[PDB]
Design a protein around this ligand. Structure first.
Ligand code: HEM
Ligand code: HEM
Ligand code: HEM
Ligand code: FES
Lengths: 147, 58, 241, 75, 70, 377
């Protein structure tokens, strides 16, 4: 009885009308210019969708798999070479990777401070990983969804 | 049965507070598995809303 | 007038300690709710996923939700839009504010159906008694049409009507739905909308009785064991001669 | 306060005890037990019981008059 | 409605309504009913007699009902 | 060694381990720990409730439903709180009664603190019931709070001061929440002082005689008997919350608040019903609330009317009957209190109220004197 009563009380601090998860938001990509960071609501979390101008894909086509934490390339992330859909969280804490103002690529992950790039990747330090690609998947070329 | 079950329960498992604690905790596990299910089972003498029974129909 | 009648005791499948709740009935009762009852009665404390594990299957419940619509979030301007209901929005206010009920309903306000079984004595019995049983207004009683006559209902002047008139049917397994069967089911479903926890409540209760029934004797034997030095104990008084 | 060894002064009283692991926790439980509960009940009924029945009666009477009052024949 | 749904209530009610306790109760109903009609400036309104009948009937209804219901 | 010397352990040791206790206390002494238990159970389920409840009129009721449907195990937590409040009252009523019967009140400080403890939980529980913002929550909040308006020249202002508005509105709910949170902690400090004064003499016992001559350590003996005791509290509590969650609350208080309705009902929860009966038995605004109050503060007069040469009732037959007539009379009072103020109920509710006061203030002390005389004392 002790466990059970304790467990109930403990398990009471978790769910509710909080299993929602709808989203899969209607996005459109030529609809947004060429590289403008665009956050949505996916189960809540700000889905940072930055597009890719040719020039800025080449700084992302330039990574370092030899010297890396979570081994990957911008190409090894995105399935359609110039359309990676990012998110806003930061693998360390909760500073949604602010559009620009950072080191490599573009991205910057504040809170305190951590530097990202146009693949979400952690270039400098604080955040252990490279953000989260919501399967990033589309519908057609211009048309796009998530998941 | 013979030189007593309790006697052996005492001699082999209850003379130390260690083994005592240890059996109670091991005995706690199984009991939960046996009872939680046992009571859920006995409860099945109500083959009604029995989600399993409905699962087959729809 | 302060003169009235109290509902009898119907033998529901969910009364009497350890007792499930007829789930096939909650479902027919849901049907009754959506078709005939919902038109003028809100059940704003119940959502579509509540109907999941219980009666319907996941897909089934969504399909019902999908069907009609609600006013979903703001269109990128400042007007809202419509879309097929998801599993997460509560059943569907037929009247905006309270005075809308008065307007479309003689001047009376039909009370919410989220609880009702717990908000009226006798519970399902009162609803059952209010439903099925309807009578001819006796002599000297002056109805006035808006108010119908109803035994059980306090004052006897109601405003509802008997929306059970043997039908406006539905059906899965095709239950011969007379006014009786259609009433039992609503109440059974109503029990569930009021007290969803009903089943589990009584399951823990079974376990609580079995455990208490096992701990109680044991804790007693623990206690008499230690008190035995005192219960069995002897005194003698040996003063100097 | 109070402790043990500073309670009071007692003289010439022996107390025999027996270890709990050497006696039964439920000796004549039904044998000696039940007669005792009957004896305790006897001793107390005449002081507990009456006040209550006085209410028991006041209760049923009280309700009848109430219910029977909300009715009437002529006038 | 016009004829063809076998309302169990109606069926069990017949047998129920009939019975002794309700026979007597309905007698008083009719008794009082016929008084109320037999005048003008009256007010003894026959409301009580109805409930008593119903009560007696309804207890017996509950006892015999749901048995048949599916 | 370690238990006896260490600054914190001493306290525990002196209160639950080596405390000399009479080898004589019966079941009626268990309500002490039981209240202690009820107090914690009521703070613990209470806190978890505050993690989901919101004290604003438009979400108040909704948040309580949110708890029972959506919050995992919210329902048990909710009903345990609800029923623990009644369980806390049955125990409170056993405890006061026990002391009255056994002369335990001769320990003035302990007792007087006990009366402060009785009032504190009553004020606490009354605020508790208003929180869900149900029909009864609002009208019970209205009816009861309005009593203070009988106090001359101060009353109107008083009622308006605590109300926050001119009614039981927004200010009142949030207000009542805050005090319902702060009260049980204060209750605790006070229960510590209750136990502090009690420890100065140790417990009384059924004979009212004196047990220095036969004390036993609180440990195996009363720890293990309190355990078995708490277990039975749990049974009663759980039997209530699992099988009949709304039994003592009655099917009623659902449906939100409506400041224009006024249900033909209006009665506080069962634990105030005896007081409720006494109040309405008196045709008079002032007198009603004066006698309402007096019906509880009279516990502070009991020791001044002891009268008997023996402390307990164990050896006093006439007093026993009179005591039982008090309890019997208190049933009548709650029973009446739970009924409309019409024909039969008024006059007995009136008579029973006079009896309550006649019994405690005149009949009981007289019986003591008679009893002394029959024993040639
Ligand atoms: C869709 C058509 C319906 C309308 C227009 C309607 C309207 C009303 C009205 C006006 C009242 C208040 C009666 C009064 O205050 O005098 C009422 C009460 C009530 N309604 Fe309906 N109703 C409908 C269907 C239903 C159904 C199908 C049920 C349940 C099976 C239901 C459940 C109830 C109950 C249990 C009450 C009792 C309130 C009380 O006892 O105080 N309603 N309804
Ligand atoms: C500081 C500790 C406490 C906290 C944090 C607390 C919290 C709450 C909350 C949030 C509610 C509203 C939710 C609800 O109604 O279920 C509530 C209601 C209530 N409280 Fe407490 N409470 C505490 C102590 C107590 C005490 C000691 C009592 C006295 C027995 C009490 C009696 C009640 C009652 C009777 C209700 C309404 C019953 C109900 O609707 O469930 N509470 N409490
Ligand atoms: C928060 C509520 C209360 C708590 C936690 C509490 C606690 C206790 C405890 C733990 C005891 C130990 C003795 C025993 O087990 O009976 C006790 C005894 C006592 N209490 Fe309370 N009590 C409360 C309310 C009351 C009130 C309402 C009264 C009466 C006005 C009261 C008056 C007394 C008296 C006179 C004793 C001495 C009993 C004896 O020695 O026979 N307490 N109380
Ligand atoms: S998580 Fe961004 S620096 Fe802390």
């Amino acid at each position: 009885a002790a466990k059970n009563v304790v467990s109930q009380f403990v398990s009471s601090m978790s769910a509710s009308a909080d299993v929602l998860a709808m989203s899969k938001i209607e996005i459109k990509l030529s609809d947004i210019p060429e590289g403008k960071n665009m956050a949505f609501k996916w189960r809540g979390k700000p889905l940072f969708v930055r597009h890719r101008t040719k020039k800025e894909i080449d700084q992302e086509a330039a990574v370092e798999v030899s010297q890396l934490r979570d081994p990957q390339h911008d190409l090894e992330r995105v399935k359609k070479p110039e359309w990676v859909i990012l998110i806003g969280v930061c693998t360390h804490l909760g500073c949604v990777p602010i559009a620009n103002a950072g080191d490599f690529g573009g991205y910057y992950c504040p809170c305190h401070g951590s530097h990202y790039d146009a693949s979400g990747r952690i270039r400098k330090g604080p955040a252990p990983l490279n953000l989260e690609v919501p399967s990033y998947e589309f519908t057609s070329d211009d048309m796009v969804i998530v998941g | 049965v013979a030189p007593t079950l309790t006697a052996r329960l005492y001699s082999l498992l209850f003379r130390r507070t260690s083994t005592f604690a240890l059996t109670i905790v091991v005995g706690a596990l199984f009991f939960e598995r046996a009872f939680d299910q046992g009571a859920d089972a006995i409860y099945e003498h109500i083959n009604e809303g029995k989600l399993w029974k409905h699962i087959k129909h729809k | 007038s302060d003169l009235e009648l109290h509902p009898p005791s119907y033998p529901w499948s969910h009364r009497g300690l350890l007792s499930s709740l007829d789930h096939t009935s909650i479902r027919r009762g849901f049907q009754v709710y959506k078709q005939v009852c919902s038109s003028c009665h809100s059940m704003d404390y119940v959502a579509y996923r509540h109907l999941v594990g219980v009666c319907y299957t996941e897909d089934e419940a969504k399909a019902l939700a999908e069907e009609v619509e609600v006013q979903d979030g703001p269109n990128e301007d400042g007007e809202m839009f419509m879309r097929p209901g998801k599993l997460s929005d509560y059943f569907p206010k037929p009247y905006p504010n309270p005075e809308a009920a008065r307007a479309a309903n003689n001047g009376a306000l039909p009370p919410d159906l989220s609880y009702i079984v717990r908000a009226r004595h006798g519970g399902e019995d009162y609803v059952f008694s209010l439903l099925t049983g309807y009578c001819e207004p006796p002599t000297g009683v002056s109805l006035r049409e808006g108010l119908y006559f109803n035994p059980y209902f306090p004052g006897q002047a109601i405003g509802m009507a008997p929306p059970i008139y043997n039908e406006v049917l539905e059906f899965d397994d095709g239950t011969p739905a007379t006014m009786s069967q259609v009433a039992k089911d609503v109440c059974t479903f109503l029990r569930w909308a009021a007290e969803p926890e009903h089943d589990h409540r009584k399951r823990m209760g079974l376990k609580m009785l079995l455990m208490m029934g096992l701990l109680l004797p044991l804790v007693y034997a623990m206690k008499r064991h230690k008190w035995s030095v005192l219960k069995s104990r002897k005194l003698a008084y040996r003063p100097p001669k | 306060g109070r402790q043990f060894g500073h309670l009071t002064r007692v003289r010439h009283v022996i107390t025999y005890s027996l270890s709990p692991f050497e006696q039964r926790a439920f000796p004549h439980y039904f044998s000696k037990g039940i007669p005792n509960v009957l004896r305790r009940t006897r001793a107390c009924i005449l002081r507990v019981a009456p006040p209550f029945v006085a209410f028991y009666l006041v209760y049923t009477w009280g309700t009848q008059e109430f219910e029977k009052s909300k009715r009437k024949n002529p006038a | 409605e016009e004829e063809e749904l076998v309302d169990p209530l109606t069926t069990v009610r017949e047998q129920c309504e009939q019975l002794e306790k309700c026979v007597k109760a309905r007698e008083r109903l009719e008794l009082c009913d016929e008084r109320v009609s037999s005048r003008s400036q009256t007010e003894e309104d026959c409301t009580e007699e109805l409930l008593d009948f119903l009560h007696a009937r309804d207890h017996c209804v509950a006892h015999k009902l749901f048995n048949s219901l599916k | 060694n370690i238990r006896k010397s260490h600054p914190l352990m001493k306290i525990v040791n002196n209160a639950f381990i080596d405390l000399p206790a009479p080898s004589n206390i019966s079941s009626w002494w268990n309500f002490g720990s039981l209240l202690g238990i009820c107090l914690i159970l009521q703070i613990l389920t209470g806190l978890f409730l505050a993690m989901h409840y919101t004290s604003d009129t438009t979400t108040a009721f909704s948040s309580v439903t949110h708890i029972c449907r959506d919050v995992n195990y919210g329902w048990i937590i909710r009903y345990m709180h609800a029923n623990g409040a009644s369980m806390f009252f049955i125990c409170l009523y056993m405890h006061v009664g026990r002391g009255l019967y056994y002369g335990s009140y001769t320990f003035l400080e302990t007792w007087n603190i006990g009366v402060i403890l009785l009032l504190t939980v009553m004020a606490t529980a009354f605020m508790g019931y208003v929180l869900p913002w149900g029909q009864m929550s609002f009208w019970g909040a209205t009816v009861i709070t309005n009593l203070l308006s009988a106090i001359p020249y101060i009353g109107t202002n008083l009622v308006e001061w605590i109300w926050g508005g001119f009614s039981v509105d927004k200010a009142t709910l949030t207000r009542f929440f805050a005090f319902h949170f702060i009260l049980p902690f204060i209750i605790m400090a006070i229960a510590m002082v209750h136990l502090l004064f009690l420890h100065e003499t140790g417990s009384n016992n059924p004979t009212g005689i004196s047990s220095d001559v036969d004390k036993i350590p609180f440990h195996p003996y009363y720890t293990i008997k309190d355990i078995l005791g708490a277990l039975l509290l749990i049974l009663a509590l759980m039997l209530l919350v699992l099988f009949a969650p709304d039994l003592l609350g009655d099917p009623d208080n659902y449906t939100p608040a409506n400041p224009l309705n006024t249900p033909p009902h209006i009665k506080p929860e069962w634990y105030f019903l005896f007081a409720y009966a006494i109040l309405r038995s008196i045709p008079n605004k002032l007198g009603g609330v004066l006698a309402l109050a007096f019906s509880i503060l009279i516990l502070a007069l009991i020791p001044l009317l002891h009268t008997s040469k023996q402390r307990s009732m164990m050896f006093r037959p006439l007093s026993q009957c009179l005591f039982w007539a008090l309890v019997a009379d208190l049933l009548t009072l709650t029973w009446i209190g739970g009924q409309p103020v019409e024909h039969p109920y008024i006059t007995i509710g009136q008579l029973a109220s006079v009896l309550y006061f006649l019994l405690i203030l005149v009949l009981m002390p007289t019986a003591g004197t008679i009893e002394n005389k029959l024993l040639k004392w």
